[PDB]
Amino acid sequence: SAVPFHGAHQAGIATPVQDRLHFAAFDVTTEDRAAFVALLKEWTAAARRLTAGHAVGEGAYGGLPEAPPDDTGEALGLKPSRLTLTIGFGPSLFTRFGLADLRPEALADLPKFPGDNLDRARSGGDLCVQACADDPQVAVHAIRNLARIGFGKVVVRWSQLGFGKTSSTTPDKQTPRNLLGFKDGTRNIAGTEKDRLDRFVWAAEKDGTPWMTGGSYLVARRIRMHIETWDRASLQEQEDVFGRDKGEGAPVGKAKERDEPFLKAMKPDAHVRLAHPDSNGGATLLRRGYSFTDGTDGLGRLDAGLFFLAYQRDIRTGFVPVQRNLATDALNEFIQHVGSAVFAVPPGVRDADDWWGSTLFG
Amino acid sequence: GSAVPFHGAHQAGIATPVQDRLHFAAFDVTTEDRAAFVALLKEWTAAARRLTAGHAVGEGAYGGLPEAPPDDTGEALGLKPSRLTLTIGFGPSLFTRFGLADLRPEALADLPKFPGDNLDRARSGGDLCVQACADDPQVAVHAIRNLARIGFGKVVVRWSQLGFGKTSSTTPDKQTPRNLLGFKDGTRNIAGTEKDRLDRFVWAAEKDGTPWMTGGSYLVARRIRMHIETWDRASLQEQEDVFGRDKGEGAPVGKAKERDEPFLKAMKPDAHVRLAHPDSNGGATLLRRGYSFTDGTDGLGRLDAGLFFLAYQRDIRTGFVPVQRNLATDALNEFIQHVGSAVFAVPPGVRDADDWWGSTLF
Numbered sequence A: 001s002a003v004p005f006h007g008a009h010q011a012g013i014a015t016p017v018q019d020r021l022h023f024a025a026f027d028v029t030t031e032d033r034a035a036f037v038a039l040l041k042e043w044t045a046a047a048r049r050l051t052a053g054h055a056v057g058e059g060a061y062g063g064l065p066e067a068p069p070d071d072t073g074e075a076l077g078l079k080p081s082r083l084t085l086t087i088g089f090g091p092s093l094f095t096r097f098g099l100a101d102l103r104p105e106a107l108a109d110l111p112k113f114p115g116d117n118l119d120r121a122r123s124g125g126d127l128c129v130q131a132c133a134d135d136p137q138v139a140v141h142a143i144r145n146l147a148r149i150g151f152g153k154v155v156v157r158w159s160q161l162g163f164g165k166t167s168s169t170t171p172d173k174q175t176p177r178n179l180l181g182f183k184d185g186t187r188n189i190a191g192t193e194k195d196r197l198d199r200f201v202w203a204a205e206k207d208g209t210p211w212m213t214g215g216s217y218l219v220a221r222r223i224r225m226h227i228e229t230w231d232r233a234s235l236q237e238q239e240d241v242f243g244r245d246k247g248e249g250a251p252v253g254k255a256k257e258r259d260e261p262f263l264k265a266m267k268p269d270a271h272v273r274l275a276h277p278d279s280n281g282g283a284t285l286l287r288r289g290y291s292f293t294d295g296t297d298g299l300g301r302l303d304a305g306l307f308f309l310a311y312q313r314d315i316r317t318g319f320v321p322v323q324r325n326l327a328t329d330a331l332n333e334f335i336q337h338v339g340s341a342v343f344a345v346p347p348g349v350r351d352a353d354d355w356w357g358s359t360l361f362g
Numbered sequence B: 001g002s003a004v005p006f007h008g009a010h011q012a013g014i015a016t017p018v019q020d021r022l023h024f025a026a027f028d029v030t031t032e033d034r035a036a037f038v039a040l041l042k043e044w045t046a047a048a049r050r051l052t053a054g055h056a057v058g059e060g061a062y063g064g065l066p067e068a069p070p071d072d073t074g075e076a077l078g079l080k081p082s083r084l085t086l087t088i089g090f091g092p093s094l095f096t097r098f099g100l101a102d103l104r105p106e107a108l109a110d111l112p113k114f115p116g117d118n119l120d121r122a123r124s125g126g127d128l129c130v131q132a133c134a135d136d137p138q139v140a141v142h143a144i145r146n147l148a149r150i151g152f153g154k155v156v157v158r159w160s161q162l163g164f165g166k167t168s169s170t171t172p173d174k175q176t177p178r179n180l181l182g183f184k185d186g187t188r189n190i191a192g193t194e195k196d197r198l199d200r201f202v203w204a205a206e207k208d209g210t211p212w213m214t215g216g217s218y219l220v221a222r223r224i225r226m227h228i229e230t231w232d233r234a235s236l237q238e239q240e241d242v243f244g245r246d247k248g249e250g251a252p253v254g255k256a257k258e259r260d261e262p263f264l265k266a267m268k269p270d271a272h273v274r275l276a277h278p279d280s281n282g283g284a285t286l287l288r289r290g291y292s293f294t295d296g297t298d299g300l301g302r303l304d305a306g307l308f309f310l311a312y313q314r315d316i317r318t319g320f321v322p323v324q325r326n327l328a329t330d331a332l333n334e335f336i337q338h339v340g341s342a343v344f345a346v347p348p349g350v351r352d353a354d355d356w357w358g359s360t361l362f
């Protein structure tokens, strides 16, 4: 029904994966640190209400007739829907408010990768809010109302809707398929794996940036699939690209989805072989991405793909080595990375008096 | 997760309970071969029978010849039917092909220009449409993708629109959904149980003049942008006055409950409900079946938001046109703009397993 908002960690990372996403990047328009802090406090108060299924402020109706309602009202009658709201800070935020020396070293700028075709308008951003819920209207309402509360101090830079499974009809334990028709998420860090999260996802105090202890680092990549090209490939070609079969999702030479892969049986440039921790010095990621389908482009092709989200303890030892290793991935023929952003996701809101970013702003 | 029967005197997807998600595609025809088009309609019908029962198209998604592309693209494997309906319509432009000129229904009227229109011609019209509705977005995208694939070389996608959530109701026993302005939308519609009202207002009859269309309907689609910045600064009273219903309960002004009958004289003369009500339009009544959308940001710092308005009626000339003409003075016009338009003739149902989409026309 609901996911607790308070914790040592922000929710929406290790908590169960909800069916829908609305991810928004924002740019900050104010130069006034005090004004920004005030906004973070107001947003935290709103997030507390939103995640409990309550309207922001004094509500969506029943206030002064001559005043705009505090909540825009489109989630009235809906359930909390496991809403989580996760905030992150982009590198560009640290050029404001005297913060330059508090940028974490683990918040690294990404290199240019072969085949990148990044749209600058759907890249970057000073901050992000990841809204995940089982009902997309609950997520959209959250973003719309945060944006409204922030008007005059922040603007929306770019926005992405996404979907995974539909939980009402699909068992929780079934791996979702991506839009290439392959199971996606078999070998991942699970939110149950507390030690793996400590090793590979959460920032530790000894890593170098005390304010980020209990936070994580997020890489977002908007990855278009060339759907119509992929659908013309043979079944063999598709399986060869991944190193798993399409029906069961077993590694080649194995029988079951969850059988551990034998990498040498896969083609050298198969995706799974290149991305596996054993191929990358042990580098391991929490993937928490969502499929997207935005419509059709000017050529009549499906604008669809994977809005890839990865959480890690350090960008330099998580996404960067793994993505570097995908330079020769057979999958590259059928995908293009068209948007990118990185964010430092701070620690959790500890209790009712705490607020997003309090460890940074003080 | 249940299936909706595909066969019937009417196509499903009209009077059917409104499903959570939409994927609407308009296609243009690129073949001049009548036989080839008929063959496509039959292949599409066969595919639709599989898709709406939760089965893969053709010989399946895997287990075929390794050297051939799979017949089904595979991303719906393991998913329930999810109330998928597939509804086909034919646009006016179709009737310039295949010797069909004389068979264009009079009720398939071109819309006049309405004040305030700003129609994008690229995202308007279309020789044909497929409306895919389901409770699972993946199921809906799969259906459209596989239809388009089957149609390669004979049809191209002209434009598409995804709807993330419904803003309509054919089931008054169930909660009425809210649009992105925060109001309940669908209270006074036509219910799927109201057989007499469907015959009067929605289904084409033989006596209407076009025998091939008996049991079909006519569809108007309007893509409507919402000026949410403008709306969100309006007072509660202004918002409620725009509609003639309160925001919280959605009761007619003065009254206590949603489903109490409107008393039109208590509404402002330019209130939406007052101008749209059948009693204000010589009895004209529509079946509204639209969905909300958001397609990113608008590039000016704000979320994009709108409503993909769909209405079914027995005759465009006696349904949508009178009512929209009467909305020329609507208070709602301050907050919306129509930016895409199409009309379609939705043929009768597929009677049984030997029938096919468009068989009464061809």
Ligand code: HEM
Binding pocket: A178, A180, A182, A183, A184, A185, A186, A187, A188, A221, A223, A225, A242, A244, A261, A271, A272, A275, A276, A277, A285, A305, A306, A308, A319, A322, A323, A326, A335
């Ligand atoms: C559209 C783009 C992509 C698609 C369709 C895709 C698909 C898949 C699939 C089907 C699997 C196998 C099942 C599983 O274990 O999840 C997989 C595994 C994986 N992918 Fe990707 N992927 C994409 C992009 C990326 C990117 C950008 C990265 C990282 C930079 C990445 C990292 C991984 C990792 C780490 C694994 C697990 C390997 C293992 O430990 O076995 N993927 N992906």
Ligand code: HEM
Binding pocket: B179, B181, B183, B184, B185, B186, B187, B188, B189, B222, B224, B226, B243, B245, B262, B272, B273, B276, B277, B278, B286, B307, B309, B320, B323, B324, B327, B336
């Ligand atoms: C973004 C655009 C629109 C919004 C936000 C909107 C909103 C609403 C709302 C809140 C209601 C009251 C509840 C209900 O009975 O459904 C309503 C009713 C209605 N609307 Fe709209 N509407 C829009 C566009 C249109 C258009 C374009 C038409 C027709 C051309 C239309 C026709 C109707 C009708 C027929 C009713 C029911 C009136 C009655 O019989 O009581 N609407 N609309």
